Design a protein around this ligand. Sequence first.
Ligand code: SF4
Ligand code: SF4
Ligand code: SF4
Ligand code: SF4
Ligand code: SF4
Ligand code: SF4
Ligand code: SF4
Ligand SMILES: [K+]
Ligand SMILES: [K+]
Ligand SMILES: [K+]
Lengths: 116, 116
Amino acid sequence: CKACETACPQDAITITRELPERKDLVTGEIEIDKDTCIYCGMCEEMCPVDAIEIDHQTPSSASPVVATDIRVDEDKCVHCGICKRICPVDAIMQVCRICPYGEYEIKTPEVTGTSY
Amino acid sequence: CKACETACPQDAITITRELPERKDLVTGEIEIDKDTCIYCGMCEEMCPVDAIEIDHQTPSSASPVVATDIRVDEDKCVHCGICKRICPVDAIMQVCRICPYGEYEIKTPEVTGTSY
Ligand code: SF4
Ligand code: SF4
Ligand code: SF4
Ligand code: SF4
Ligand code: SF4
Ligand code: SF4
Ligand code: SF4
Ligand SMILES: [K+]
Ligand SMILES: [K+]
Ligand SMILES: [K+]
């Protein structure tokens, strides 16, 4: 818990702990149909964990688009559903699996560490 | 809605309508492990839509069992979860997908018919 590390008046204590990765405490599916996507940016703004990334650009006559790609980083996504609800053209498919499949897909966290 | 069919004092109106099938308004997985199953009948009794069927029999020395098969009719199952909770030997695996996947797996009902 690291209380003693904080409490030690001489900073004599080191407490380490390895926590689980975020991806492993969460489960769901998410896909963005980039052809439907019109790159309004609203999902990128609203995503509270900054998992969505858009390759913005200034258009040119060779490339007359305001963006060239959009991606979701599933290492960060926690499947809150905000992006799919805000998308004006319903280009995002997103479903959280925690309640139906959480027992099987999310391993109970083992917290490791050492003291010195 | 057929109110006019009912209201017509001369029974002059025919109104038809084709409702969706029950299976298409509902989503889930369900399977029964027949080797674990002891054929106690509790799920068949509790199933509120009579979706579970047990092939009961009187035992004989050639066939010393009180039932030879058990089945779930998924055309009838609405994935309420009762059978799995009542099962004394946890022989039923059942998952309901309605809330997480209902947006994608359950098609919006569109009710057709005509008038005369
Ligand atoms: S000891 Fe292990 S536990 Fe007791 S405090 Fe220091 S850390 Fe938290
Ligand atoms: S919102 Fe729907 S549309 Fe606007 S960007 Fe994120 S995805 Fe492309
Ligand atoms: S889901 Fe909640 S989190 Fe995963 S991306 Fe769309 S928003 Fe960012
Ligand atoms: S008309 Fe079509 S709607 Fe108006 S009542 Fe007879 S049925 Fe219900
Ligand atoms: S309850 Fe568990 S056991 Fe008794 S029947 Fe339905 S399944 Fe086979
Ligand atoms: S789930 Fe609800 S419905 Fe489908 S079977 Fe077990 S009980 Fe009958
Ligand atoms: S809640 Fe969990 S269970 Fe009750 S319905 Fe929506 S999904 Fe099926
Ligand atoms: K300290
Ligand atoms: K953001
Ligand atoms: K029944």
